[PDB]
Write a protein that binds this ligand. Structure first.
Ligand code: HEA
Ligand code: HEA
Ligand SMILES: [Cu+2]
Ligand SMILES: [Cu+2]
Ligand SMILES: [Cu+2]
Ligand SMILES: [Mg+2]
Ligand code: NA
Ligand SMILES: [Zn+2]
Lengths: 84, 514, 58, 261, 98, 47, 43, 227, 79, 84
């Protein structure tokens, strides 16, 4: 792509207000629409015990020391495979 | 001294006038070319004899109307005449350079005329795509003459864009902000930005086509690893912006006309109106590939381009509705100009909706390259650009000349043209849906009826333009000078009388910083 | 060198009714005439070429 | 028709636009005569009238500003916008060429060996002369800046000295680039690689010459005291243009010379 | 090292450039480069519109965020009012006396 | 400069005689409309 | 828009002539070429 | 193919073309709605003596006329994209045929097993046997088995051309040095016509395409008889 | 081992409308396999697959020119 | 690499003079030394008649129409092979 919306993308609080509500925010709504008219759910990946993943050289200092911080059971398998 | 005044001008008014004259003339050439097209298609069989002459004609038709009629009239003509007058400026920022923008046009035109005379001319389509446009399928100077015409035209408009933007931004009364300039002025500023950014990419593209034909480069030749599709991308990156550049000044004029003849001080939703043009201008730079849906691009990118193309309807919708909101409660004067503006509003809407159909890549597979697209762009160009040009012309003609037109004849003119163009293009929707390709000099028997009706409509329009030539004659012949003009308080261009003196705003306007 | 700008300001501000492209003297005029001649002559020349090429000359 | 009470400039009718337009007609058709009917007369006449036009048009601009004092603050501000806008379109012009390059090199076709650089092409080494050119141009980015400051501080000798260095550096780049063109083992006719390489750096090379003569003009205008410590737009534009040329080179270097080979 | 040698505006500016340069020092604005400050616009404190002739066009931005400027010719004579807001404007002679 | 001003004076063509105007306009637009037809003819006449 | 009366009014007859001249200048040259299309096509 | 005085699309010979007919009906419904709304409003505005020339507040209605069109567009886009993805859908073809555009004729190549290749020219109107279609008849049709998924690969040997067949919903440009793929599938036997859809020079109007669909069995024998 | 071949099946490496690489790659791969199996004293019957595929997809003219190129040793692909 | 030469890479004609002679120009000398303590001569490449090179779809409008503009015989072969 490229860009060119005529002029006035500089100087005047009214101009930046204009850009805030006429360009910035609308972009956010579009990307929000998109990110929701696409974002459903990725089927949880097949578990295969690769050695370069699920690294454990020292147990995490919390919980049972085998679960990453934002562990998500549906998508994050333990080194032994998915939880439940 | 005819010379000092007409060849060495540095006056925005005289230059604007020169543009209107050139554009009027070019329009005759373009109209003639459009008739030869319909003549050939008005009856099964072939009329011209060889289909290369047909193709040459179809091509020239496009370049003339686009580069030599619509742009000079809208931007060079109405632009130069009105812009300084609407913002109280003495002239443009670079009056000498402005004169070169004009004088580059006759040479540029000459080269286009020369291309169709040497060899067998350039029967490449206005898209001038290679290999067809290459030195093998089109050997000879023709395509090269066409490329050079385009270079000169480009240089002319780029220089013009710089002038308009500088002028509009730097030469307003110190207290007047950009949000206090009339919509036409905004419309020509946004158009100037689009020209400034798109024309150079075209120039790059056709320079590459030129070296391929003459310096043994292979940008577009697979033999050397080139790619004919690369041309398409560069051409259309310029091409979409160009179509919005052809309509924006028109959006501006229609706003002034609808407002004036409704007796309002200002158009409805002025800022929504400014927002809409900026948006259209912006989005108009990221939708180009909708002209390449049958070229073989990944499905995901085709989905992106149809999605992007559709959002352009939102800002366009606020304009159409704002024009209607402007008419609301107005004290309507049914002048010729107002008639042209009402026609534009409707016809443009039809042509624009039809473009939404085409935005669908899935459906475009079967509509691409058929007459359905020829119908679309003729609705938005022949009944969009042109209708604005006519309305603007009859409305401001008294300001440019100091004389008035015979209002009745003008309405007669509108009525005829209204019938001619619809008869000519409406049928073509059928041809497309049913499969008739574009750029064909003959067609399977089944498509006879519609092509026949269509070619007939084209003669009606011919009558209308002949008539128009007369209408201008009679105004100058009769000499009814103007006395008083309505609504000058909100229409500055008229404040200096008709016609305004050579030098206007010798002493600037006075605007308080309240 | 030496600053002779003030002297040129006077020559060019002199109310002689001459447009800036000639206000400089007799040479401006010859340049002007040379330029216009070449342009027009060359333009005629090109029109001629256009003609010759217009017809099949082979 | 009284005494004007606004600060803008109304220019005297001028024949230069007509002449420049005619020049354009002569060059394009002259190029058409050269490419097809192997003659250079028209093109030559065209080139000549063009220089004559540029010389006289810009001569007048100097007369109108330095000698007649028409460049009020309002007029200068306008000139700044015009220059900037001009540079912007030049950037877009070059963008077409970078697009072409990236298009070809990122998706090399079977007829090229399906690889980039194409099989059969021996690219130059970016650590040799191309590195040199890079350092020459950036160095002139620095000297022109010293020139500018010397000027604003009213130092005539140093402004001339710094301006001189900048110029020889640009000339030096031209000579080096010309040598490379000659030494290169591939040509413009060597497929998309040679096409892409020579039109992109060729055009840039052309801009380096345009920038140099622009600076040369500024040099002479300075020798003759045209510039004051506060009013010197001709120089500022000369400088902005020079930085543009500098930047474009950096992109060629990284894209075509480094990454593209 | 240092040196000097480049002229200053004060010494080399000519024509209109110099005129606006000099005029700017005395706080004056004969070339309408600056925006005029409004008065109260009453009949007794009208906006004084300087003119080098006997009429100047006035554009009244009746309210701060108006998109439309109201335009009209102010004549030599008594104070005229904006057709829209009634603000008063009175012509006065410009510094170059006609 | 001292260029003339007013209706019929800010144009490059004289509008003082409506019939001479009729002629100039006729030639003007006429030549314009005519050109394409003769080009098509010119092309048909080379082969 | 109000105007003074025509300084040099164009009577109906004058108009009829002006209209006739105009149309003709558009139809004759094209008719000539078109009529002779065959004479060119056959070569 | 197209019949005299036709208004819409040619009847659908394949399933995607059916899909398109319906999608187009849907879209057209909407354009009728909008265009009729706009005309009614315009006529409404111009038919009253009541006036209100003073200023009106901008913003208030602008939201309806921004949100509404946004919703309508999503209603056109969803279906549009669904079909768009179907057309490219991972199909498992039982035959591959190539076609190469040339300056003024198409040549076909069936090479899965044999080296079958042939040119296909338009039959001149003066050599048309009674009942044959004027600029649509080709001497050698491209025979293919009906009711099967064929893979077509389009390319060209000179300039650009475009291989199209309305009835089946196909149009794929033929570009030198490039192989474009499209998926053909007919649900009926018969003859189906199309024409070059990219300006390729003087005879761009005269290089049709005629497809002949017959059962597999007859396709095989035909293959062998063509060498 | 397939000779019950109908036509080149869907290949995820080349999933879009542009199949230029599909032809090219299979053409290359074949001649590379053929060369290896001939250069290490082996069976070219392994290289068959590629020939069927590239044969199905590649235009005749492309295959002809590439072969001619290989003969004269100007084939740009590295085989 | 990176960069950091203490401060003063901005403001003062003396500063830019300092950078011009203390950093810019010396860089040019180094690159010149390098570009000459390396640049000798690349042995002319073996000629092989590839079709995607030495393109000729239309003869150059100068000389014999078969020689590129800055043709260098030592390194640029004609379509038929090297010249001499
Ligand atoms: C005046 C110039 C102009 C304008 C303004 C437009 C406007 C539009 N055009 Fe068109 N178009 C052309 C001129 C123009 N076009 C030309 C010359 C070509 C052919 C070039 C060639 O190939 O030779 C072309 C071709 C073209 C194609 C190529 C098709 C093909 O070749 O197969 C496409 C594809 O999407 C397209 C779409 C659009 C769209 C979506 C709009 C949108 O801007 C329209 C938006 C307007 C409206 C939508 C109506 C008003 C809105 C409302 C009342 C609100 C409600 C609406 C909805 C909710 C739907 N146009
Ligand atoms: C501005 C753009 C424009 C305009 C106005 C028109 C006007 C006309 N066009 Fe258009 N045409 C195109 C641009 C335009 N065309 C383009 C881009 C193409 C594609 C080319 C290609 O495929 O490569 C095309 C192609 C094209 C085709 C398709 C050819 C083919 O596919 O083989 C057809 C066929 O009917 C056609 C017919 C017409 C007709 C009958 C007119 C008639 O309306 C003519 C009637 C006269 C007017 C409507 C205008 C009169 C106005 C004036 C005279 C100015 C007045 C002056 C002043 C007041 C100052 N044109
Ligand atoms: Cu577009
Ligand atoms: Cu074709
Ligand atoms: Cu074709
Ligand atoms: Mg196409
Ligand atoms: Na016909
Ligand atoms: Zn007011």
């Amino acid at each position: 792509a490229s860009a060119a919306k005529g002029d006035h993308g500089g100087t005047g609080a009214r101009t930046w207000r204009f850009l805030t509500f006429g360009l910035a925010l609308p972009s956010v709504a579009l990307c929000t629409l998109n990110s929701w008219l696409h974002s459903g759910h990725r089927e949880r990946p097949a578990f295969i015990p690769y050695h370069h993943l699920r690294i454990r050289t020292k147990p995490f200092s919390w919980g049972d020391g085998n679960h990453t911080f934002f562990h998500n059971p549906r998508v994050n398998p333990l080194p032994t495979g998915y939880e439940k | 001294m005819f010379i000092n005044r007409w060849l060495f001008s540095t006056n925005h008014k005289d230059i604007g006038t020169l543009y209107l004259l050139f554009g009027a003339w070019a329009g005759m050439v373009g109209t003639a070319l459009s008739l030869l097209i319909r003549a050939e298609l008005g009856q099964p069989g072939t009329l011209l004899g060889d289909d290369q002459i047909y193709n040459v004609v179809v091509t020239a038709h496009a370049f003339v109307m686009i580069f030599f009629m619509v742009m000079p009239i809208m931007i060079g003509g109405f632009g130069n005449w009105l812009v300084p007058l609407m913002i109280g400026a003495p002239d443009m920022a670079f009056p000498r350079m402005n004169n070169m923008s004009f004088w580059l046009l006759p040479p540029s035109f000459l080269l286009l005329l020369a291309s169709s005379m040497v060899e067998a001319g350039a029967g490449t389509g206005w898209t001038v795509y290679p290999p067809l446009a290459g030195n093998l399928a089109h050997a000879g100077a023709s395509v090269d003459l066409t490329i050079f015409s385009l270079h000169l035209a480009g240089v002319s408009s780029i220089l013009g864009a710089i002038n308009f933007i500088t002028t509009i931004i730097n030469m307003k009364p110190p207290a007047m902000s950009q949000y206090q300039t009339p919509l036409f002025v905004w419309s020509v500023m946004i158009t100037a930005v689009l020209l400034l950014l798109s024309l150079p990419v075209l120039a790059a593209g056709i320079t590459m086509l030129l070296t391929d034909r003459n310096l043994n480069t292979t940008f577009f030749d697979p033999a050397g690893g080139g790619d004919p599709i690369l041309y398409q991308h560069l051409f259309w990156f310029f091409g979409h912006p160009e179509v919005y550049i052809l309509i924006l000044p028109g959006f501006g004029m229609i706003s002034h006309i609808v407002t004036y003849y409704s007796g309002k001080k200002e158009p409805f939703g002025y800022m929504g109106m400014v927002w809409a043009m900026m948006s259209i201008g912006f989005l108009g730079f990221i939708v180009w590939a909708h002209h390449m849906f049958t070229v073989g691009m990944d499905v995901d990118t085709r989905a992106y381009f149809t999605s992007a193309t559709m959002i352009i309807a939102i800002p366009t919708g606020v304009k159409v509705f704002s024009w209607l909101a402007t008419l609301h409660g107005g004290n309507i004067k049914w002048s010729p100009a107002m008639m042209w503006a009402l026609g534009f509003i409707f016809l443009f809407t039809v042509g624009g909706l039809t473009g939404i159909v085409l935005a669908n890549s899935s459906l475009d597979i079967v509509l691409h390259d058929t007459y359905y697209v020829v119908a679309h762009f003729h609705y938005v160009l022949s009944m969009g650009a042109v209708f604005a040009i006519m309305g603007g012309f009859v409305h401001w003609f008294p300001l440019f000349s100091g004389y008035t037109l015979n209002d009745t004849w003008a309405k007669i003119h509108f009525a005829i043209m209204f019938v001619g163009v619809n008869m000519t293009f409406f049928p073509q929707h059928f041809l497309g849906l049913s499969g008739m390709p574009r750029r064909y000099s003959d067609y399977p028997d089944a498509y006879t009826m519609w092509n026949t009706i269509s070619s007939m409509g084209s003669f009606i329009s011919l009558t209308a333009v002949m008539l128009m030539v007369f209408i201008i004659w009679e105004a100058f012949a009769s000499k009814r000078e103007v006395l008083t003009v309505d609504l000058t308080t909100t229409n500055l261009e008229w404040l200096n009388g008709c016609p305004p003196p050579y030098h206007t705003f010798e002493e600037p306007t006075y605007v308080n910083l309240k | 060198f030496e600053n002779r700008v003030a002297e040129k300001q006077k020559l060019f501000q002199e109310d002689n009714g001459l447009p800036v492209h000639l206000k400089g003297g007799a040479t401006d005029n010859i340049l002007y005439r040379v330029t216009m001649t070449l342009c027009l002559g060359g333009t005629l020349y090109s029109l001629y070429c256009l003609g010759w090429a217009s017809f099949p000359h082979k | 028709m009284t005494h004007q009470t606004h600060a803008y400039h109304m220019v005297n009718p001028s024949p230069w636009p007509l002449t420049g337009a005619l020049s354009a007609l002569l060059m394009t058709s002259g190029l058409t005569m050269w490419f097809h009917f192997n003659s250079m007369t028209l093109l030559m006449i065209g080139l000549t009238t063009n220089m004559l036009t540029m010389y006289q048009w810009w001569r007048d601009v100097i007369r109108e500003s330095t000698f007649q004092g028409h460049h009020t603050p309002a007029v200068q501000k306008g000139l700044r916008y015009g220059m900037i806008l001009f540079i912007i379109s030049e950037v877009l012009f070059f963008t077409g060429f970078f697009w072409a390059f990236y298009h070809s090199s990122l998706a090399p076709t079977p007829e090229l060996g399906g690889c980039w650089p194409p099989t059969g092409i021996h690219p130059l080494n970016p650590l040799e002369v191309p590195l040199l050119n890079t350092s020459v141009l950036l160095a002139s980015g620095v000297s022109i800046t010293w020139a500018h400051h010397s000027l604003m501080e009213g130092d005539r000798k140093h402004m001339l000295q710094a301006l001189f260095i900048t110029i020889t550096l640009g000339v030096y780049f031209t000579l080096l680039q010309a040598s490379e063109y000659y030494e290169a083992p591939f040509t413009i006719s060597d497929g998309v690689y040679g096409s892409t390489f020579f039109v992109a750096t060729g055009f840039h090379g052309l801009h380096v010459i345009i920038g140099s003569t622009f600076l040369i003009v500024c040099f002479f205008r300075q020798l003759k005291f045209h510039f004051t410590s506060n009013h010197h737009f001709g120089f500022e534009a000369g400088a902005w243009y020079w930085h543009f040329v500098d930047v474009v080179w950096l992109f060629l270097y990284v894209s075509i010379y480094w990454w593209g080979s | 090292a240092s040196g000097g040698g480049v002229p200053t505006d004060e010494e080399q500016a000519t024509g209109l450039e110099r005129e606006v340069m000099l005029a700017a020092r005395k706080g004056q604005d004969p070339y309408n480069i600056l925006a005029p400050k409004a008065t109260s616009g009453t009949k007794e404190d009208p906006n004084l519109v300087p003119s080098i002739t006997n009429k100047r066009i006035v554009g009244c931005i009746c309210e701060e965020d108006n998109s439309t400027v109201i335009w009209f010719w102010l004549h030599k004579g008594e104070a005229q009012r904006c057709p829209s807001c009634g603000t008063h404007y009175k012509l006065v002679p410009h510094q170059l006396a006609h | 400069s001292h260029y003339e001003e007013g209706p019929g004076k800010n144009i490059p063509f004289s509008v003082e005689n409506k019939w001479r105007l009729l002629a100039m306009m006729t030639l003007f637009f006429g030549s314009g409309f005519a050109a394409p037809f003769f080009i098509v003819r010119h092309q048909l006449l080379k082969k | 828009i109000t105007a003074k009366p025509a300084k040099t009014p164009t009577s109906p007859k004058e108009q009829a002539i002006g209209l006739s001249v105009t149309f003709l200048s558009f139809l004759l040259p094209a008719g000539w070429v078109l009529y002779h299309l065959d004479n060119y096509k056959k070569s | 193919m197209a019949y005299p005085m036709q208004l819409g699309f040619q009847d659908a010979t394949s399933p995607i073309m059916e899909e398109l007919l319906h999608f187009h009906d849907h879209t057209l419904m909407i354009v009728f709605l909008i265009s009729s709304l706009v005309l009614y409003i315009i006529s409404l505005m111009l038919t009253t003596k009541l006036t209100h020339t003073s200023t009106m507040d901008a913003q208030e209605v602008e939201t309806i006329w921004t949100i509404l069109p946004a919703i309508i567009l999503i209603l056109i886009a969803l279906p549009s994209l669904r079909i768009l993805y179907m057309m490219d859908e991972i199909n498992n073809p039982s035959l591959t045929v190539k076609t190469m555009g040339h300056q003024w004729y198409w040549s076909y190549e069936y090479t899965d097993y044999e080296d079958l290749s042939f040119d296909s020219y338009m039959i001149p109107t003066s050599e048309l046997k009674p009942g044959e279609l004027r600029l649509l008849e080709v001497d050698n049709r491209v025979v293919l088995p009906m009711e099967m998924t064929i893979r077509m690969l389009v390319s060209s040997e000179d300039v650009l051309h475009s291989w199209a067949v309305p009835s089946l919903g196909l149009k794929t440009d033929a570009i030198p040095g490039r192989l474009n793929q499209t998926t053909l599938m007919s649900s009926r036997p018969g003859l189906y016509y199309g024409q070059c859809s990219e300006i390729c020079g003087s005879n761009h109007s005269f290089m049709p395409i005629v497809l002949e669909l017959v059962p597999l069995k007859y396709f095989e024998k035909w293959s062998a008889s063509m060498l | 081992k397939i000779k019950n071949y109908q036509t080149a099946p869907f290949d995820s490496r080349f999933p879009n409308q542009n199949q230029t690489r599909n032809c090219w790659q299979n053409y290359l791969d074949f001649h590379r396999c053929e060369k290896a199996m001939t250069a290490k004293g082996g069976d070219v019957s392994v290289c068959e697959w590629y020939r069927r595929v590239y044969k199905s997809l590649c235009p005749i003219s492309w295959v002809s020119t590439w072969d001619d190129r290989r003969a004269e040793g100007t084939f740009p692909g590295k085989i």
